[PDB]
Amino acid sequence: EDAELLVTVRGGRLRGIRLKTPGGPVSAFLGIPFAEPPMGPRRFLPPEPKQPWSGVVDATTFQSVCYQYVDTLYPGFEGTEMWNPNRELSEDCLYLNVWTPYPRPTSPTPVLVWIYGGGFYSGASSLDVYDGRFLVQAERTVLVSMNYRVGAFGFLALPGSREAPGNVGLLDQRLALQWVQENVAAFGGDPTSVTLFGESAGAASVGMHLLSPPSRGLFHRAVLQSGAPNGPWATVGMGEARRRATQLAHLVGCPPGGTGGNDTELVACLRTRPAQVLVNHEWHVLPQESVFRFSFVPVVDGDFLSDTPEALINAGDFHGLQVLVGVVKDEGSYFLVYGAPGFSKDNESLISRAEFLAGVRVGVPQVSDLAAEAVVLHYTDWLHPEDPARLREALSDVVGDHNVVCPVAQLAGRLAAQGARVYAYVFEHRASTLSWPLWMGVPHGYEIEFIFGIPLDPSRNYTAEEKIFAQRLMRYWANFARTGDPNEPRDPKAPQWPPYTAGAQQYVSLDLRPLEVRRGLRAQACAFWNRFLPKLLSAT
Amino acid sequence: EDAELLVTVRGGRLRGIRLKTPGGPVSAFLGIPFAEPPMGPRRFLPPEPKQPWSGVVDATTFQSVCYQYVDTLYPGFEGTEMWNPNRELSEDCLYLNVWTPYPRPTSPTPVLVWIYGGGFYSGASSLDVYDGRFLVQAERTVLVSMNYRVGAFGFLALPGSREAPGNVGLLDQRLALQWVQENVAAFGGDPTSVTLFGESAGAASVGMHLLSPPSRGLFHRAVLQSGAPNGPWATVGMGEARRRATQLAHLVGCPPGGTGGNDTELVACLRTRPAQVLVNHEWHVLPQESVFRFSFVPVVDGDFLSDTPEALINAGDFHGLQVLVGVVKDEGSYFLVYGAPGFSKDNESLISRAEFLAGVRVGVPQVSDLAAEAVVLHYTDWLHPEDPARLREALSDVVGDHNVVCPVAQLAGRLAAQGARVYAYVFEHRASTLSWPLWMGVPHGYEIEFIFGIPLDPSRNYTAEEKIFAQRLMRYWANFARTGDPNEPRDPKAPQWPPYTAGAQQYVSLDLRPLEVRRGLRAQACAFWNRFLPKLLSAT
Ligand SMILES: *[C@](C)(O)CCC[N+](C)(C)C
């Protein structure tokens, strides 16, 4: 019992907490420091390892959320506020959490590291939908989740500078992975079987960790849910990163007056500003009106990413690696209520032809009028070119395919055709608790509560079928973590999940019904985005 | 009886012939001269009306075919030689034929004028598949068919010249229509109910007669089968026409030596050459390797066509006109054995990816590498990008849509949306007698034998179902000629044929089964050709 709630790691000692699930207790260690607080002169810099302490650190409650913008588009609405911070905001925020089974496993157990999404500008490991108590109890594995800096504090980059090098939010994630290497065995975890998994910007982070040598030696399998490192939103160039960082400094009064504008004094002035001041101007440095675009994201600096994610995927060897990838049915609907004209979460969003054509300029920013014309051609139903419900679904497919589905299929194809064993899925169940409107289908990010077993929580009004569905999905993810193969290593009756190959392009659909194999991750639509559109942009 | 085999028209007297069909005799007048022979100094010039004669002209057999190239791609093969000339070749060839019922109708009967196709380079009114004896006997109407000059003799144009103005093959057709106005009443025909119908280049001719004022006063309804005046092959510009005419003169030794090259002496030298000499070099003036392209076709001269067919369709009023238009299921397969690499009528033509990409350059000549890339994107099955049978069908759709199906749908839409009542069909029956291979489906031009009632010929091995099918199709065409409405004016049980509108885009499919209404003349594919591709070519 309480003998297992006190663990000694290399920094010192910790007191854990025992959480209860309907089928047994778990041991949790919430709020372990893994880095020095990145405040004062440490803002925008890479993290430093946490110095050893004396006494015991209390690891019984989640620590503070990293400073981030707070969504206020629909105040009081469950759909948006379920992702909003549930702890006080502070720059002192680099803490990680470990869930471990009770009684503690006697032999090394596979470790899953969760990396949250939120467009690299928001999110926290302390959210209720990321509670690792159900997954660890049912599948008897070790779950780790960390906080990493987001927004300007994580990804403001002045390239070439030493004061604001950029990507330090990814460096926070890497330090946590070194920490799991050096300490997970104390909780019963195998440091030789580590599986990263993330969603949205978490999946792009997992992807970028695949393409940088220093991080690859810290894990062994990868799960990318609804995101990829080569997505048009997950990366920015050195020239644009400099422009957004400088525009931000200008908006907050740096350089004052008055004085020259070198990088050292720009960051020195940015470091004297209160954290909330930088946050209130973060959306004001975007170049266009757009959905699915965020200000401060990973930069191609030549260090963490020696080349663009596209180049690094094409010129890489991935033998001996297993990857699980997939999308939900309606990847694009979620973002349309964030800017697309005619869209509102409180009505049918039956848009007109004129609003559809305007929405295309928002959903596909930074492209020529001719390029937009190609998008309108491919995504119009010329038998019903003005049907509002069809144009609604079309724009959702425009945003979905351009930002998630096609970037993912591109990554999955090349990974399989270059040594990696890849499994692909499509999440097609819509939760009965979903507070978003019906026309959004299954939106971006609403598979997570089923991967984490949230339906097992008795205080939630899920259905009996959805509880069995959750337990099935948890086994898939756990099995992939133990064996690298989502299929149960011996049972044959349940339908099997074939790998994804560049030729057959096979994937399964996850819903209340048994597994069904399909072919093609929107192959027709994705050929436009992955093949034809790049050439259409090179030729003026 | 034989009292009705002698008719007096405004030129003189004629002796006809009585032909037998399984259900009654018909009266035919084959070989009536309607113009002076365009020989010697009359070559390349517009036709002159036939001067009155004395005695009686024998109108009992077909006259001579206009000089034309003779297909020799498959000597001895029924599929090709059924379209080859079946009478002696001569420049003395401007003759027309009238079929009329027996006994002669007592009240004015609607008149159908047939205009044959053959890429404006071949064809004759004397072909067996254009025999008007079955259609006139069963539906008791008047059928007229003429010969018009083809190839250089009909369409060699030096624009601005008076010696070779061009389009005189169309002027031969117009003179025949004036003739039907001035003489059809002598055979029992109503000069106030004239219906043009043609196929391939015959349908483009019917279309161009709709867009030129002097010819519109000569007919009242139009049927366009597998062709349109705005097709990329049916028209050439003044600059290109001059180049092809001059290249032809060069190949036959004009100007000799030696002397300057003005238009008057070029045509004067072209007129001293034997007809067979000009024919043997006709294909040698084409600019590229291509299918569905022909050397000497109608020219935009500003006279017969004041503007391009595209401009004239867009800026025209078509109220009070009824049009019947349609295509066969596989418009493109026929031409692939004329140049597309990998294609042969004697094997399965299972082409490779490399041959498909080369075939696209042949089937869509004169377009940029980027434009071809768009065609490959839209017509590739990215789930089976190297399936030979799928690429075979894809290339047939490339040629079919680009040259026939999309040019037709473009014309039908604007006609309906500008006053004309339009009916649309798709011919989907493959004759049991078809000697072409199976993979060609139903090819270009193999609805004609069913419109003319050829299956009723007892010496042919057609099936009993196909005989009923022919009689049904003949009623459709006849009903449209009498009433302007293909549906039977009173019977309701048989399914009805709704008009074609730009919005609903409704059409019927013609085969052994009852009428079935469908929507969309390849709307998705045709939006690429009619909307997006033009813009892709303007932008370099
Ligand atoms: C992705 C860009 O990180 C989007 C994440 C959105 N939520 C709702 C999943 C946080």
Ligand SMILES: *[C@](C)(O)CCC[N+](C)(C)C
């Ligand atoms: C059209 C271009 O005239 C093609 C006609 C081909 N035949 C086989 C119908 C003559």
